[PDB]
UniProtKB/Swiss-Prot annotation:
Residues annotated as catalytic: 35, 52
EC number annotated for this UniProt entry: 3.2.1.17
Function: Lysozymes have primarily a bacteriolytic function; those in tissues and body fluids are associated with the monocyte-macrophage system and enhance the activity of immunoagents. Has bacteriolytic activity against M.luteus.
Name of the featured protein: Lysozyme C
The species this protein was found in: Gallus gallus (Chicken)
Amino acid sequence: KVFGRCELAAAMKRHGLDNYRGYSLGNWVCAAKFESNFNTQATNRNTDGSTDYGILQINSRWWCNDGRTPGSRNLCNIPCSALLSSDITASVNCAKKIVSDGNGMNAWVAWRNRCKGTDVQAWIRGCR
Ligand SMILES: [Pt+2]
Ligand SMILES: [Pt+2]
Ligand SMILES: [Pt+2]
């Protein structure tokens, strides 16, 4: 599924991301936009043997188990394929774990580069 901006904002708000650990909702919309272009099926296979999966491009070395990645810790306790669903719940739940395990949103390259220091509220402005 390729979400619209306001659609995805509403789904993320229903799953409690607004002000999660002090990150406003527009941060999370912005991260997904520059990670995956709001595409739930996005994958990126890296040269190091890990793969990034889904709308927040969660990586298989630390967070999910794909059976193909050396070193994997599976800290979100999920198969990586569960992050390729049209339903964002698994991605959201895992992201919450990523930010809590002492990581900020700096964990996401795209957030650090394309969202940090910008007006992220633009990404939800005009939505209901
Ligand atoms: Pt939902
Ligand atoms: Pt829901
Ligand atoms: Pt949820």
